[PDB]
Every structure is written in C-alpha cells, then in structure tokens.
Design a protein around this ligand. Sequence first.
Ligand code: HEM
Ligand code: HEM
Lengths: 362, 363
Amino acid sequence: GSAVPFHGAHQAGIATPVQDRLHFAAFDVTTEDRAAFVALLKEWTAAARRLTAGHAVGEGAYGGLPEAPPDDTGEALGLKPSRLTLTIGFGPSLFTRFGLADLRPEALADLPKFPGDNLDRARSGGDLCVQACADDPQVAVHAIRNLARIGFGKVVVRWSQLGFGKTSSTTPDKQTPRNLLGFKDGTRNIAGTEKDRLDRFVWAAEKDGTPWMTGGSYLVARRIRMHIETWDRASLQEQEDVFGRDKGEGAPVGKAKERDEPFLKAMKPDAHVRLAHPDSNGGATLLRRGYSFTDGTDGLGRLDAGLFFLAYQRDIRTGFVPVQRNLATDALNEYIQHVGSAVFAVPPGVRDADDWWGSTLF
Amino acid sequence: GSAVPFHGAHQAGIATPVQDRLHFAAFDVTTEDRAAFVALLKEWTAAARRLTAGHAVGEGAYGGLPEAPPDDTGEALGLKPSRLTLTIGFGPSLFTRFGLADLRPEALADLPKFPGDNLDRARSGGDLCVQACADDPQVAVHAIRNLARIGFGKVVVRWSQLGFGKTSSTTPDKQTPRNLLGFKDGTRNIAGTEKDRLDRFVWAAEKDGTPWMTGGSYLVARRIRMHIETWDRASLQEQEDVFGRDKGEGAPVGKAKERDEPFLKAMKPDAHVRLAHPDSNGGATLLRRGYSFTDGTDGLGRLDAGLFFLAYQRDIRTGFVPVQRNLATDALNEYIQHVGSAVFAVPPGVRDADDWWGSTLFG
Ligand code: HEM
Ligand code: HEM
C-alpha cells in the first residue's frame, strides 16, 4: 500500500518494481498555444504529486462550494497510494508543434514495417502518453480520469489500454509472473538494482546527442493479440519447443532451474529465447515491462486475449529494432499478431518541488 | 482466509464474502443432445472442485505425455486459491432445449422493457452463465478460459465482462467500497450473515412452486454505463441531491453517520435512495453483488466505465422488477444507461463429492 517517491533524476515507473495493474493512455494535443501547453504540464505535475501520495487533487473531493464541481472526482477517497507511478512520454508527432521540430531526438526513430503487422491506426500513435501503474485498479483509473479532466480543451484521449495482470519483472528475488500462454515471462530482464546495466542499456546520456533527454529513456508499445484456440490445441512438446524453456519450472531446455543460464545451441534454431537473447543480437538488451489484457469476446464464440508489450531502451535503433528484426523467423509468430504500435521519448525525472514534466524541453 | 468451500446446500458466491475481482461469462449451447450436455455438467463440476481448491484441471498443466495438449492451460500455476467461487446459472433460452419447457420456473420471468433501455443484443441474454469471483483476476480468468476449453464443441462464449471492487490487501474489510461516481455503494444491503433475511428474500423455497429450484436463487445482470464526463461537470450539490446522501461520509440528508437510518421525506422526491428503498416498494428487498468496470475509451475519447449490476432474489417478479419500475423518474437516469441485460435461475448447491451442477433439474 506504500507510496513510491515521485521526484528523482529519472521518472519512476521504469526501474520501479512492477505493480499489479496498468492503465495506459495516449493523448493528442488540440491547442496551438505553447504557453497554454506549458501551463498544462505544470498543472499535471502538481496533480501527480498529490495522486502518487494518496491525496486528492486541487482543493479536494468534497467540502467546497456546493454550487461548484469538486476538484477531485472522489472515487479514490479512503484508499492508500497503492504504489502508484505516473510516467509521461512525448510522441514523434508532438515535435511538429510549438516550434519543436529541431529538438526531436534521433533516438526517437519511427519503426519500420515488420512482416505479419496488422496495425489499427486508431489504436496506434499519439502526441503523448501517461503510463499509470498501481496495485489497485481504482487508484490507476482515478489518476487517468483526473489528468484527462484537468486537460479538457487542450488534450483529448486518442486510445487507452488496461492491463489486468503483469507479465514482467524488475525484481528477480520475487516470483516471475505468467502470461496467458502459461509460461513465466520476465526471468532474464534488467533488475532495478542493476545500476550499471540501466546506465548502459536504458538511460539516455548527454553524449548520445540530445541534451534535454539526459536521464530519460525511449518507450516502444506493441498491442499483441494471442491466437489462444490455436495454442491450446498444441502439444506440450510443441509449446516448449516454441520458447526453448520448459513450462512447469521455466528452466532452459536440458537444465533444472528457472534462473540457470540458457545454453542456446540446445534450443531449436527458431526458438523465441534463442532469437531474442542479447548474444544473438550483438549485445542488444531491453527492459521489458508489459501486462496481459482481455477485451471481451471476439464475436466468434471465444475469449479475446493478448499482451500489451512495453519496452524501455536507451536508443530505439539499438534496442527494440534489431531484436524484433531477428524475430522474423520466430516459432512464436504462428500464435500472435501485432495489432497496435507507438513510440515515445520519456523525459528525465522531476528533480524537486519547483520542477515540472518536460521542463528540459520547454 | 484463503479458500471458500465448494459444497453446500447452496452454491457459494451468493451469501459468501465478497471477493475483490469478477470474471462473468455467458455461454450459448450448441448441442441438441441431452446426454452430451449432462456429461459436460459432470466434467465442469469435477473441474470446479479442482479450481476452487487451487489445483489444476484434469492430469495437470505439465508433466504428461509430450505429444498431448496439457489438460490445464497453466496460467494459474504458482497462484493461491484466492477465495475463488464458481456459480452457475440457467437462462430462459435453455428451457427450449432437451424437452425442458415445462420445468421453466414461473419466478424466472422475462424482464419488461424499461424507459431509457438501450440494450446491445450481443451483450445480452445467454443459455448459461458462470460467475467467477476471486481476489486475483488471473485466477478468475484462468477458470473461465479452462471451462470454455473443456466445453468446446458443446458451448461457446457469448459475452464476457471483467469487474473490480475493493483491493483487500490495502483496504479494510468493513469499509464500504465507492463506485466510479465517488459515492459509497452497499450501505443498506442484505448481508451474508443475515440468515433469516436470506430465507425471506433470496433463496427459493419448496412451496414457491418449482421443487428442483429449492435452495437456489434468481439472478438479474445489468451492464450500466456511466456518463462519466457529464457527471464530473455537475456541482457537488447536484450530485448529493441525485442520491439523497452526502458524498464525503455517505450519511442520509439531515443525519451525521453513514449507517444512520434514512428519513425519506427529507430527500428530493426523485432521489435514487428514496425511490429504491423497500418502504417505497411494498417491502421489496434485494441482495446486490455488483462490480465496477472500466473497459477502455470509446471512439469519441470518453471513458467506457460503469457498474456491472448483479442482484439475487427469491422471485424476479417481487424483487428487481418492482424496484427498477420505481426508478422510472430517478434523478440518476440523466447520468447512466442500461446497455446489457440477462436473467438466470441459479440452482441449489452441490451437496457432496458425488453430486453435480444441475442434478435436481436433469435427474
Ligand atoms: C506475446 C508475445 C510474447 C510472449 C508470449 C513472450 C514470451 C516470452 C517468454 C516466455 C520468455 C522467456 C522468459 C524470460 O526470460 O522472460 C521471453 C523472453 C524474452 N522475450 Fe519474449 N515474448 C513475447 C514478445 C516479445 C517481443 C515482442 C520481444 C522483443 C521484441 C521480446 C523479447 C524477449 C526477450 C529480450 C527475452 C529474453 C531473452 C533472454 O535474454 O534470455 N518478446 N519471452
Ligand atoms: C450505476 C447505477 C447505480 C448506482 C451508481 C447506484 C448507486 C447507489 C448508491 C450510492 C446507493 C446508496 C448506498 C447504499 O445503500 O448502497 C444505492 C442504493 C440502492 N440502490 Fe442503487 N445504484 C445504481 C443502480 C441501481 C439499480 C439498477 C437498482 C435496482 C433496480 C438499485 C437499487 C438500490 C437499492 C435497493 C439501494 C438501497 C436503498 C435503501 O434500502 O436504502 N440501484 N445505489
């Protein structure tokens, strides 16, 4: 139930232990007035300081003037902070506004088309994003709803995604969660304690070429549908061969324990783990932080199921792009389809109580 | 505690403690063969016994023959029972199959059209339901996914709804949950401790007319969207006047504490509490067991959120129908819309290890 500190050199919600629930929103900007947009970023930062400490925004949820709408919508009253983090990102499309064209980072690369992509344009892209993670879904919905309300007239929600359960780990000391295919997901990630690996693979550095982004990161979001009818009729051996790990323990093929190191030559040449491993990709390493979803039925008698994949990296060109390119022959492709995509530059942290989201850019 | 017993005179999931999360699924039957359907009910009961104890279905999720699909899909390995309950119900449309038309209970009444209804036919009705409630949403989803798999070829999933209430790890058990309008929700309800009130208002009795249903109950489900962005622009006074209770404490107007008994004459005539109260409805009293939902955002950027309303009662004609009829002029109607509906007869409990869901109906 405890609070996660909001201020720092980096934004929380990346290296932080992964919380149980997600509410992710992408917004488009509707104002052309730079000063008005700056005012919004400041007001949002002030609200985020309240929300992440379990307090109501503005003057509260009740006890004001009877004839005015309350400043806070009130549905998180009496709840703990529940490890809420709020992480903001800026999309490539933002940099066509407010005279920002020459400040777009090179590392904020547009993704190529990948074989098998079927991207819905309405649930792709976005001028900006807010990732809300918490252990209580009500706390996460409250945060997104109140930010959107404050932004009325300056921003609109483009698309959103809820995640009911995590499929990732930044804490190797704790149990690794399973995805809806029934396999542990998150064994070989980057841990929040691994400061050297975070500096090498996740945080942007001054020397990388974009000063305002120092201490930030780059985010790729992919909405992935899972063909569960097809998967659920596969044999146990087929399932294990797809990944290169056994289902019950999650050990590499031939080994006894989850955290034993993979021996790649024992895996099939199209096994997911073999293709995705840093040693297969010139050392490229990612911080994975995704969640499972189910959005009803598919209208054909079946449950809908998928994975909302999130990865953080120091440079999109040296992280997600080489790895996903190497997955062109993945055995897993038979059972999944990418149906949504977005990239964002995640700025540095809010240093103290006088700072504000995006201050290094604006 | 960690598990809820499966066996009993009544099914669990009605009077037993309210769990943090819901996965509710409605199913349509595709077979015409009565024997095949009975065999499914037996297989589903065997699976439910395993699932509610935190065990995998059948021979397990791994360690069987490599060339066979696993019996259990594996996504709940390592999780706890999580207070899982599985509650089955039968829709009016099931009774047009298997020669059952003369065994439909009179208390399983079709609902009338109510003012302002905008029902999506695709998210309404169903031959069967399974209500899966647990404190961990992955435990609930795993249960529905595996029942649907076991049934493939005999049933399909018609519609599915996820919901949430409180998070019990961080929120005290005695605190009333708030709904997404920011008001406390559940103050004046039937509690599972009230044995006599359950007998009077919730459980079907033998003398009610349908012997196979003795110890069962009747369920109404309504998916109710809230117009969140319109509500959030209303004044504090307007929101309180809609309900007849204050927002901070949830006390009735003119009183000081949440649990103070209401004085109906102090509320506005079309306030929700005044219209819904038993004294306004000839004594009609309901067990509410609903869950909030937030599904995402719609094509206009608005939040697709609301209340998945569930009510249990001894007879639909003397429970939900009179009360919802009385809400025709409710001040709350400005901010909500009913967009899905279904009714089910929930049979009696599974008595012991040799009994099965539906045994009193099928024989
Ligand atoms: C529905 C889609 C996916 C599923 C079900 C899935 C599943 C898994 C599983 C079960 C593991 C093994 C345990 C672990 O180390 O985490 C794994 C590893 C991994 N996955 Fe995926 N994955 C999916 C999509 C992706 C995508 C899109 C990428 C990147 C483009 C990716 C990158 C990785 C990486 C880098 C590893 C760790 C390899 C290593 O260093 O040992 N995965 N995945
Ligand atoms: C989105 C829809 C609804 C919302 C937000 C809502 C909200 C509330 C609230 C805040 C209360 C007061 C606290 C309490 O005693 O629980 C209440 C009471 C009540 N509601 Fe509703 N309600 C909704 C729909 C319905 C429907 C559809 C019915 C029945 C057909 C219903 C029946 C009642 C009853 C019987 C009470 C208790 C009144 C009493 O005995 O004091 N509600 N509701």
